[PDB]
């Protein structure tokens, strides 16, 4: 199943991006006066609300590499959601042409 390979890998990729992104955000934001994304617990929640595109604004990067990490977290969460949605649609379609009599 190709659609389950792409969705399954993207979700694994997303988890790696969320954890590494939380780590790399703190590493890139510290050293910049005024930054508030400087502790791992709340940086872990920031990566989730970034990947899900919620983006409250309570937490955000101010540096270049912090923003580059943010972009990666944005793209990873969006593409993973696009692949899973696509994989679900083909799963339902193939399931629907079955149950009738089409294999």
């Amino acid at each position, epitope marked *: 199943a190709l659609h389950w390979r792409a969705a399954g890998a993207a979700t694994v990729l997303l988890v790696i991006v969320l954890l590494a992104g939380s780590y790399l955000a703190v590493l890139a934001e510290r050293g910049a006066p005024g930054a508030q994304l*400087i502790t791992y617990p709340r940086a872990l929640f920031w990566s989730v609300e970034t990947a899900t595109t919620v983006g409250y604004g309570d937490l955000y990067p101010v540096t270049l590499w912090g923003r580059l990490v943010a972009v990666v977290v944005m793209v990873a969460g969006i593409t993973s959601f696009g692949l899973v949605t696509a994989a679900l649609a083909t799963w339902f379609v193939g399931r629907e042409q079955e149950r009738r009599g089409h294999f």
Partner: antibody
Amino acid sequence: QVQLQQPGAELVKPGASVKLSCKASGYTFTSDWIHWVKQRPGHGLEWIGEIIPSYGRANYNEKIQKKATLTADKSSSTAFMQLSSLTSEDSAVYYCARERGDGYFAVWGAGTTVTVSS
Amino acid sequence: DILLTQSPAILSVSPGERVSFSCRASQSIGTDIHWYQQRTNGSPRLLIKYASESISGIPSRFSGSGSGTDFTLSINSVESEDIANYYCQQSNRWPFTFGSGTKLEIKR
């Protein structure tokens, strides 16, 4: 079981340098930050800089003059601070502290009494 | 950066009396304040992390409160071992800063 072990004291000639150490026992996570705090006799706590040994990146206090250079050795779990070009104004007690990346200093060292005199 | 002002410099109190130190920040820092104790010729010791939450090993005598720009460390019934220097530290913004400190003295 002192988590952060520092030498007792260090004597430095005016204008010379010294390499302070901070051997770390206990749990050593990849999210650990080692902070260095300067304290003069009869004075308060002053933040010098931080370093994450798992990555090797260090930040410093911009409001003061850069006298320190932070390094680390993951194989021996020991962070180092290089105080260069010392005067009498650099004579103080230097602590090292371990932060779990959650903001607070959970454990402190005994402090190293650095004296700059001829 | 964020300056932390501690008042008063020296705090006199009678034994068995509830005392309170004050830590105030230049700007709103939520609850990201931490309290430390330093006795004579000793190293700082964490008493309170994140304004109100306690630390294992530290007596229930110590308690903290406040948010925004006004923080308070209280001691129910001060005894002799409480005589030390108390500092507050913020972790809301980079860089971490310390308070000027408050010395506690007991009027026995």
